Design an enzyme around this catalytic site. Structure first.
Site, PDB file in Angstrom:
ATOM      1  N   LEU A 188     -60.321 -12.384  -8.457  1.00 21.17           N
ATOM      2  CA  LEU A 188     -59.396 -11.296  -8.673  1.00 21.17           C
ATOM      3  C   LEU A 188     -58.877 -10.752  -7.348  1.00 21.17           C
ATOM      4  O   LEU A 188     -58.660  -9.572  -7.203  1.00 21.17           O
ATOM      5  CB  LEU A 188     -60.056 -10.188  -9.492  1.00 21.17           C
ATOM      6  CG  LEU A 188     -60.572 -10.533 -10.882  1.00 21.17           C
ATOM      7  CD1 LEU A 188     -61.221  -9.342 -11.528  1.00 21.17           C
ATOM      8  CD2 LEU A 188     -59.490 -11.059 -11.747  1.00 21.17           C
ATOM      9  N   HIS A 189     -58.688 -11.650  -6.393  1.00 18.51           N
ATOM     10  CA  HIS A 189     -58.273 -11.297  -5.048  1.00 18.51           C
ATOM     11  C   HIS A 189     -56.837 -10.901  -4.987  1.00 18.51           C
ATOM     12  O   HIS A 189     -55.984 -11.632  -5.396  1.00 18.51           O
ATOM     13  CB  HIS A 189     -58.488 -12.455  -4.106  1.00 18.51           C
ATOM     14  CG  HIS A 189     -59.841 -12.477  -3.488  1.00 18.51           C
ATOM     15  ND1 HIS A 189     -60.829 -13.336  -3.900  1.00 18.51           N
ATOM     16  CD2 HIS A 189     -60.373 -11.745  -2.487  1.00 18.51           C
ATOM     17  CE1 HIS A 189     -61.915 -13.129  -3.186  1.00 18.51           C
ATOM     18  NE2 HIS A 189     -61.666 -12.168  -2.321  1.00 18.51           N
ATOM     19  N   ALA A 190     -56.593  -9.738  -4.429  1.00 17.71           N
ATOM     20  CA  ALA A 190     -55.282  -9.125  -4.389  1.00 17.71           C
ATOM     21  C   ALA A 190     -55.204  -8.269  -3.142  1.00 17.71           C
ATOM     22  O   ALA A 190     -54.423  -7.316  -3.075  1.00 17.71           O
ATOM     23  CB  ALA A 190     -55.060  -8.283  -5.626  1.00 17.71           C
TER      24      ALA A 190
END
Lengths: 87, 87
Positions: free
Chosen positions: A14-16
């Site tokens: 869920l890298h943002a």
């Protein structure tokens, strides 16, 4: 209540972060800011718009600001961008 | 006004879709929702918290919901997660 412990299996989990430190910097300012990619303008202080611009490594976008600190604020985003955010 | 056209050179450009379709699904519901990773609880409807959980591919998190549709809402997130969001 409903609960599940589940494993995150997609590539970037869920890298943002990018849109993260960006919108964080852009948000620190009073100047209204915009991000335009291929004639698509979005509020630089809105993570949604950033995420929606579908901006990937290699993309050129137009960064604009207008306000009492429009100069220091673009220097930021630009400086932030130029470091690769870290990387 | 201050304007710059600049190239985005970091890996994932400004890619944040995951947290994107997630928070979008999680937001469609009345049930309050949480995401807990290693004893860190965050609102599933908040992109910030999601982004802050530092959840990567491979991470197990605890997905909870409590509301009039807590069942359909977890099925969503879970189903959404299970497809790899696409990938």
């Amino acid at each position: 209540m409903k609960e599940v412990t589940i494993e995150i299996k997609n590539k970037t989990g869920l890298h943002a972060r990018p849109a993260a430190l960006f919108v964080q910097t852009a948000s620190k300012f009073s100047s209204q800011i915009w991000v335009e990619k291929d004639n698509k303008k979005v509020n630089a202080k809105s993570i949604m718009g950033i995420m929606s611009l579908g901006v990937s490594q290699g993309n050129v976008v137009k960064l604009s600001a207008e306000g009492d600190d429009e100069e220091e604020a673009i220097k930021a985003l630009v400086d932030l961008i130029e470091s690769k955010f870290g990387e």
